[PDB]
């Protein structure tokens, strides 16, 4: 049986403030720009509709200095950090941003007649941009959050899948990486493999894997390691109703319609896609730039950061403004306007500021407690005396940024106010 | 007189947690796809605008092992489960989705445009998609929920109904079963019989019976078995105003207009349909993924699950994203784009986590209590020593999934912290 | 080590009211109009989307007339004003206002189908107006607020930036001064240097620097001088989706779409701009015309106004109505309408009522306290015996508007009711 961590983790009154200075990323919100086109190094894909998974590295409390040497006995005790409070400060202004495809696979405007539709062209893909669903989510664990998506199933050897058929859909639970893309109103699925035309969804989610956090597995985790703190805020609606150009693999049954004559002899495209939109970006609907405390967690892990590390998965699509940058191709700006002689760039910026209030915690390593933690994860006992090594995170190192002076910092001031 | 169930049902202090791990269904959101065409098995009509009626099977408490045998006397008592708490974790991403008809019987836009003011005889059906009313309903009973809809009346032998006349609408109170269609903004009505055109409503409700729960009828139930817990939230508006093509069976009276000349000599189509639309899908207005306790019920039955079974009728249209999957006809995807070489499919995915906290309850089977239960339902005494045979439910089996270790499960943790 | 101000600042019971009677500015909301067109002096650029930083000048309390001369010791104690209450009265009616460009660099509407979907050449720029994001922020400090924006980076001499390439974006923290333009939904960016088109954004932000207050920077300020009171309320959405005309330096990768035919043989313009819009200007969402008290502050200064000065950075875009003034070019207004005989002027008006309740405070100048004050700011000891010289602040002089009789003024009555 998994016990609550308060039985074998003793909370003491020693609190610390750990804060990253300033986290800034600038990059193209749709694709990674490789070096060679006139810029040094690769411009990353920095988007607001993208998972920001910070791997917060904490110092080992068993080796660095403490206010009291006699607060614990090193022979029979080992220390661990517990996140007592969090502050995900966002610097950039609230804004809306657009992602779109130059060839968006939409056939007709199924909402109503638009008087701009032309049925003379075979390829009806046009430059279409949408906003996405307004998503804010903040997950703190000592393990990274688990995200679900829909992908192609395995290929059966006995009955092969014929080309053109709908592949079987499986729900894959992966680790939410830094740079994974959040749900956008088009669903959490593998658009690289499920969608072959590369034209049905906008440019950032075109060849990416959109992932939604599987809160059922993180809540149903026995130890509560992957998620002991969570906030959600989602908002979307359908602006424009669109068809999908292509052959209908799932033919409509004859019992569902009455045949006409000519183009109405056979039914048209019946795969319908809505245009997602986070409706209004308001400052009153913000779960960021606000202090959040961890008196009680959802799981058995009550904020205790095992292996001296924390994982903060943050999605903030409320600050999604992609800056538009123009560069004149001529060294003087021309007197008369020529659209050919101006280069247009889209650059999205993410500004993050991570404050945490951590609590020192003594663990009495008795035989039963040691056996329980060994059955939990033996690497804790190996370190006291790295599974997530290939996987990519935004690493923030607060090893030298722990401080006993809480009042020097805003989250520490708020913590001292509430205490 | 029907008494409240708390008079003869004694609630013990022991509780159980019972929860299905994950209920996943992938299927076409508009119709069932027959076998063949690359599918070795059928593709069900899995839709968000559809009744998910789970038949939860509980073990017979008079038979399996208990932590203390001496809590009841088998000679003079019997046991029954009472639902003390529920959590319907609906784990998909929040999203919007469209249902549409390739031949939607809309004449023209009567909202703004100077469209037409005449009878039209040619085929003007257009490929039109709509969203629906954003509704969530959660009903727990020990009997399946009742649903009201409007259908054709019986054929009177004295006065037969002539062909083309409007048949008399009558209110049928059927059973809300799995696969039944929820109200979609077009009304709770049998569209298969009352609409012979098969073109006025989208494909998922074109030949289906849309049913709405008659909350008046199952709250006026003497025993309250069909519904002891209910949550409602409906939200819709009208996007587009549409005239319906065809002959007007009920002619507009001459005292309601003034005749014009020529084209406006006679009134046009006057059957008007709105385009339903759930306004904004927002996460704070969700009544799922939340724990709900059953201290008091609306009726006499206070959550007591007779015949060791439960019925959970769930509609959540707030996660209605139809994933669009396209597959290229050629084995390599060509560099040039051809619209007819990509087969298109729509797949809706439904993901559930049904967690319950049940309370063991003993029944002091005296003469009056036994007579009252026998008058209430004679099958309870026969079981203590199946009317829903043809009805289609999502049968979930929780026979071997009952646990006394409440703190190891999320709903058990929330129940222990709330008590 | 910075300490909270309450340890060395003694709060007295003497309160004062300070209020500018009426602060009115009328000016062209898009640009500054120089003199020479038949009028005296220059019409300033007065816009609602513009930072109003009031430099409030307070009398020096060491020489100010006080009700009790013997309430302190001149030899061992010095005096300072502490802001106890504030009210930013806004006089103009609530309203929406528009700013636009006669040549707005948009290619086509990517919201839906737009027809003539590919403009191959020629000038496409259109006379386009937008509203902006609804922003209300009010910041009081004893130092001016710190605002962030994105500007061009410093070009390296070893690797100069080639013409036409995207310059590196650098986050500059400047001082929020009067006349600075707030972020308007297009991004807190330097539009003078980062957009060579001078056609990308409306005229009021076309050649201006849009700044957003770096709340993280002045919240993490040790002394908390720049911000001890702050209110924010931002609200926006995307009305129209527009595509930026011009050459693309960041070419869309070939693996990220499928090549079309003819006009679709190249990907079109893929830099997308939303149209910002404050959704609804509603009276209960106003954070102005309301009294706010300063019992506790986020920083270490609890409203203490060092150097006998205050800085109130206020933007209120909820009253953004740009009045339209038509003047006929004929001395009699003609009875026959000619479009070219009326001159149109846009004039925006700002009405402000700065109101404060200040508290007298004594500083016991003990040697360690004096050392702490000298370490915080050496100019305080010089004054007790400026860096903001070139900065443009709206200077208001409340040296001769301090009154002990609070009940004669509205904020004094509300303070007496509150206290």
């Amino acid at each position, epitope marked *: 049986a998994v016990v609550n961590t308060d039985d074998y983790v003793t909370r003491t009154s020693i609190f610390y403030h750990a804060g990253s200075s300033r986290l800034l990323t600038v990059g193209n919100p749709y694709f990674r720009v490789p070096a060679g086109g006139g810029n040094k190094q690769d411009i990353p894909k920095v988007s607001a509709y993208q998972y920001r998974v910070f791997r917060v590295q904490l110092p080992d409390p068993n080796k660095f200095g403490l206010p009291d040497t006699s607060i614990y006995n090193p022979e029979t005790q080992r220390l661990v950090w517990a996140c007592a409070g969090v502050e995900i400060g966002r610097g950039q202004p609230l804004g809306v941003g657009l992602s779109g495809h130059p060839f968006y696979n939409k056939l*007709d405007d199924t909402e109503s007649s638009h008087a701009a539709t*032309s049925n003379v062209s075979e*390829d009806v893909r046009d430059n279409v941009s949408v906003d996405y669903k307004q998503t804010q989510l903040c997950i703190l664990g000592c393990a990274p959050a688990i995200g679900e998506h829909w992908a192609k199933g395995t290929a059966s050897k006995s009955r092969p899948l014929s080309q053109g058929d709908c592949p079987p859909l499986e729900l894959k639970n992966t680790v939410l990486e830094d740079g994974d893309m959040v749900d956008t109103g088009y669903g959490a699925m593998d658009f690289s493999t499920l969608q072959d035309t590369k034209c049905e969804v906008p440019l950032d989610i075109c060849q990416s894997i959109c992932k939604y956090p599987d809160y059922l597995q993180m809540s149903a985790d026995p130890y509560g390691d992957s998620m002991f703190f969570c906030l959600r805020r989602e908002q979307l609606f359908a602006r424009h109703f669109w*068809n999908r150009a292509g052959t209908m693999g799932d033919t409509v049954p004859q019992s569902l319609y009455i045949k006409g004559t000519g*183009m*109405r002899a056979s039914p048209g495209s019946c795969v319908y896609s809505p245009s997602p939109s986070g409706s209004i970006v308001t400052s009153d609907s913000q779960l960021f730039n606000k202090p959040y405390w961890l008196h009680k967690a959802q799981g058995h892990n009550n904020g205790v950061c095992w292996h001296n590390q924390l994982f903060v998965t943050v999605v903030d699509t409320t600050r999604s403004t992609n800056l538009t940058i123009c560069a004149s191709t001529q060294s003087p700006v021309p007197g008369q306007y020529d659209a050919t002689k101006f280069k247009q760039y889209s650059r999205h910026v993410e500004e993050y500021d991570l404050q945490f209030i951590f609590q020192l915690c003594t663990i009495t390593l008795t035989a039963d407690v040691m056996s329980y933690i060994h059955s939990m994860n033996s690497s804790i006992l190996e370190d006291w005396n790295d599974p997530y090594d290939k996987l990519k995170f935004w690493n923030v190192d607060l090893k030298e940024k722990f401080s006993l002076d809480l009042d020097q910092y805003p989250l520490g001031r708020k913590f001292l106010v509430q205490a | 007189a029907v008494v409240n169930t708390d008079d003869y049902v004694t609630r013990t202090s022991i509780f159980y947690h019972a929860g299905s791990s994950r209920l996943l269904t992938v299927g076409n959101p508009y119709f069932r796809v027959p076998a063949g065409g690359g599918n070795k098995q059928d593709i069900p009509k899995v839709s968000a605008y559809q009744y998910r009626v789970f038949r939860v099977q509980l073990p017979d408490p008079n038979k399996f092992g208990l932590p203390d045998t001496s809590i009841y006397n088998p000679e003079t008592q019997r046991l029954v489960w009472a639902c003390a708490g529920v959590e319907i974790g609906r784990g998909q991403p929040l999203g919007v989705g469209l249902s549409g008809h390739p031949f939607y019987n809309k004449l023209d836009d009567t909202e703004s445009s100077h469209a037409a003011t005449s009878n039209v005889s040619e085929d003007v059906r257009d490929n039109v998609s709509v969203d629906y009313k954003q509704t969530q309903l959660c009903i727990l009973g020990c009997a399946p929920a009742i649903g009201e809809h409007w259908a054709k009346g019986t054929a009177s032998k004295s006065r037969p109904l002539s062909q083309g006349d409007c048949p008399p609408l009558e209110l049928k109170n059927t059973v809300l079963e799995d696969g039944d269609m929820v109200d979609t903004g077009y009304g709770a009505m049998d569209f298969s019989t009352l609409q012979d055109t098969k073109c006025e409503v989208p494909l998922d409700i074109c030949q289906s019976i849309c049913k709405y729960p008659d909350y008046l009828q199952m709250s006026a139930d003497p025993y309250g078995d069909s519904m002891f817990f209910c949550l409602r939230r409906e939200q819709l508006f009208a996007r587009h105003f549409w005239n319906r093509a065809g002959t007007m069976g009920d002619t507009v009276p001459q005292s309601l207009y003034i005749k014009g000349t020529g084209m406006r000599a006679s009134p046009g189509s006057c059957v008007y349909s709105p385009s339903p639309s759930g306004s904004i899908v927002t996460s704070d207005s969700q009544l799922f993924n939340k724990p709900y306790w059953l201290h008091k019920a609306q009726g006499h039955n206070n959550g007591v699950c007779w015949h060791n079974q439960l019925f959970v009728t769930v509609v959540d249209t707030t996660r209605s994203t139809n994933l669009t999957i396209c597959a290229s006809t050629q084995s390599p995807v060509p560099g040039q784009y051809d619209a007819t070489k990509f087969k298109q499919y729509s797949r809706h995915v439904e993901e559930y986590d049904l967690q319950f906290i049940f309370q063991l309850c003993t029944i002091t089977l005296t003469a009056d209590v036994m007579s009252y239960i026998h008058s209430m339902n004679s099958s309870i005494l026969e079981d203590w020593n199946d009317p829903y045979d043809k009805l289609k439910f999502w049968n979930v089996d929780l026979k071997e999934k009952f646990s006394l270790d409440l703190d190891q499960y999320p709903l058990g943790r929330k129940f222990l912290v709330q008590a | 080590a910075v300490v909270n101000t309450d340890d060395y600042v003694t709060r007295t019971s003497i309160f004062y009211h300070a209020g500018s009677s009426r602060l009115l500015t009328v000016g062209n909301p898009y640009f500054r109009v120089p003199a020479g067109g038949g009028n005296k002096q220059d019409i300033p650029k007065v816009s609602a989307y513009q930072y109003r930083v009031f430099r409030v000048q307070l009398p020096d309390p060491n020489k100010f007339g006080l009700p009790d001369t013997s309430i302190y010791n001149p030899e061992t104690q010095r005096l300072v004003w502490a802001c106890a209450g504030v009210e930013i009265g806004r006089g103009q009616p609530l309203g929406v206002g528009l700013s636009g460009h006669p040549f707005y660099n948009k290619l086509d509407d990517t919201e839906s189908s737009h027809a003539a979907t590919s403009n*191959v050449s020629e000038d496409v720029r259109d006379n386009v107006s937008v509203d902006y994001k609804q922003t209300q922020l009010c910041i009081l400090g004893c130092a001016p607020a710190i605002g962030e924006h994105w500007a061009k980076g410093t070009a390296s001499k070893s690797r100069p930036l080639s013409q036409g390439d995207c310059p590196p974006l650098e986050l500059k923290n400047t001082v929020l001064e009067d006349g600075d333009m707030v972020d308007t939904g297009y991004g807190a960016m330097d539009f003078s240097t980062l957009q060579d088109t001078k056609c990308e954004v409306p005229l009021d932000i076309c050649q201006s620097i849009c700044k957003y207050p770096d709340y993280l920077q002045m919240s993490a300020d040790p002394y908390g001088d720049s911000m001890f009171f702050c209110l924010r309320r931002e609200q926006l959405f995307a009305r129209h989706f527009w595509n930026r005309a011009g050459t693309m330096g960041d070419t869309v990768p070939q693996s990220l779409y499928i090549k079309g035919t*003819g006009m679709r043989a190249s990907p079109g313009s893929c830099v997308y701009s939303p149209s910002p819009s404050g959704s609804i200007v509603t009276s209960d969402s106003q954070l102005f015309n309301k009294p706010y008290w300063l019992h506790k502050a986020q920083g270490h200064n609890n409203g203490v106004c060092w150097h006998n000065q205050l800085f109130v950075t206020v933007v209120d875009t909820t009253r953004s109505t740009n009045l339209t003034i038509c003047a006929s070019t004929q001395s009699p207004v003609p009875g026959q309408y000619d479009a070219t005989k009326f001159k149109q002027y846009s004039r925006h008006v700002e009405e402000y009522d700065l109101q404060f309740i200040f508290q007298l405070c004594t500083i016991t100048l003990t040697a360690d306290v004096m050392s702490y004050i000298h370490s915080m700011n050496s100019s305080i000891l010089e004054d007790w015996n400026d860096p903001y010289d070139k900065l443009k602040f709206w200077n208001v002089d409340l040296k001769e508007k301090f009154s002990l009789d609070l009940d004669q003024y509205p904020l004094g009555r509300k303070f007496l009711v509150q206290a």
Partner: antibody
Amino acid sequence: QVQLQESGPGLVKPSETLSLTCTVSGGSITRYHWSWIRQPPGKGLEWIGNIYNRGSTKYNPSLKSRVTISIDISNNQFSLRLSSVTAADTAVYHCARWDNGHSYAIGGFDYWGQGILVTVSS
Amino acid sequence: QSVLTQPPSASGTPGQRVTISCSGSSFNIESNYVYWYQHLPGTAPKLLIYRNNQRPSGVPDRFSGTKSGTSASLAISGLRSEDETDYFCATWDDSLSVWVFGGGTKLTVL
């Protein structure tokens, strides 16, 4: 069946205005696009422009300065005006029903007028 | 390509197959639907092929349409004496943004 008829002056003197009208019988005008297409003798067809159902116009750019197309819903007609005609504007003019603007539009001109021969001479 | 390249005339044995070609460019024929029309002097043109292969109601099934690359072809199987008439192709030029038409193909039934 939808039928199109052209009416107008057969002979138009040069530098005057060429006026033609097309009447639709057996169909409605507020549904599809309506185009004017001219064939000079000795050569092929030449597109002029079309009028929408709502009243929006599109034109051939090479004739865009000289072509005005109007629509009359009450008269169920649509008219072509061609100012400053030259000798090259002598042509057989056909009004046609460009099926466009909806989901099941075939594209192109499903129904054609017979056309009227307009000769420009002094 | 303002004028689609068509043969000035075509001939064929009755009962045989006659193919009329129509050459355009990547902006008019390859990227848009081509429509094949039947026109006789003195009568209104009649649509035969729409969306490069489909036929309307009343058009005989012997007429067929194909489109390969930037070229299109109209095939008449079982040539009859009533087919001695002009045929042409029409499509939409995106580069010129107009309706381009073929020069016409007077078919003689020999």
